[PDB]
Amino acid sequence: MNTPKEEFQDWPIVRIAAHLPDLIVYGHFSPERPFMDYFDGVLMFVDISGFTAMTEKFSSAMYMDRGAEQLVEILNYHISAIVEKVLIFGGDILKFAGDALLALWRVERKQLKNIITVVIKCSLEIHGLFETQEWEEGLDIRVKIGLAAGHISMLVFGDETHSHFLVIGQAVDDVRLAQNMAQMNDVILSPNCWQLCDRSMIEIESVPDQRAVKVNFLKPPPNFNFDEFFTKCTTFMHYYPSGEHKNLLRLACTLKPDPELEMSLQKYVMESILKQIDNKQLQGYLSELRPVTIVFVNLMFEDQDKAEEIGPAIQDAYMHITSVLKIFQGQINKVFMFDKGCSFLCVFGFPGEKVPDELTHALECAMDIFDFCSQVHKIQTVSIGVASGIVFCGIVGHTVRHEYTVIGQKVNLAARMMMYYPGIVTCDSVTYNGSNLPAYFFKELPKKVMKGVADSGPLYQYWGRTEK
């Protein structure tokens, strides 16, 4: 008998799993929402704003109407290489955003020490990818890495049709703080990461006015062999591709059809992405420079550190946010959470979802969300930033691990507005002027210098329909 080779691996379920971490793909959780679980791990936050600040230049006429296509191609070339490193070193890419990706090595508490060593080595090899790389003579193209370790909580929230997850807690807060302190080419360790790590392996230096540390060198003992050390470490890595599948970047490439599993996983993925996955839309349809309105919602909690309390609060907020977005065809593109609160990146005018009055409706949606979420138990402060303009949309990452993402100055602007103008709904000049709503519905705001934005233009508070 002949033995034709090659398992077929391109099923819809596999395509869906590309959009999700192993944390979710192999998770098998209870149906209750919210769902919380608790574990330990090492986190890596890779700041990629260096080359995703390239976006505004790809809107130039020099790119001849293929700005979006060129941008995704070059971004994916670089981001792919980072993803491959993470995956080969045993990590799980949790989410992508325009300015970062977050990766996790989940392990039993006793192995944190050795896993930190693995993650440091991975971090250094990532920097090594970019040592002599650039573009257009100028732009150097490099990254900044923060590492953290310790207790991690996971939250899954959603309804009967849509799901979202977050990791939260001090280690999560720590990784953001660490990455923020990094300069180009740095690997910064959280205080706890430094506490837990194998101090014989590395040389560090202090970070002024900070207990976090910078890794200067990974200098292992005389008879250390990283490959043998790594192999020992794989004992504790549940899904590391091995044996017959050692040639694959992800076990998830081996997923077989399973309608119950696919039902669960598809809830995390936007319907337009599922359309492409099902070969009912062209594979490049979602790469675009598109005018949109960003509504960036931040929720700050009464007790910032109590997972048992924040979980239900996020779920209650989510249920309202989704009902309000449905009414005006808005979408949640990402949910993020560090030390600054839980933020929902909402978008109006996505792929094939554009309708006029996007602006008045975006503001009215923001106010509804603001009013409702302000009365949610345990939510201390709600802040919403509204910015409108051309943004890049597309699927960013590696073939095996990628996500639909939005990138642009207006996304960053809305995100900064929600943090620098807490407790109110703010909007940019495009939104204010475009709405044609009466001027007394707004308050002209003081100009604030916000990290990452030059010339925001005049900013406004959406005060609402009444003096009240």
Ligand SMILES: CCOC(=O)COc1cccc(C(=O)c2nonc2N)c1
């Ligand atoms: C408004 C703050 O926006 C950002 O910081 C975006 O950058 C990222 C990039 C990757 C993951 C995350 C997360 O916050 C989480 N992903 O999963 N759990 C999280 N927490 C955030």
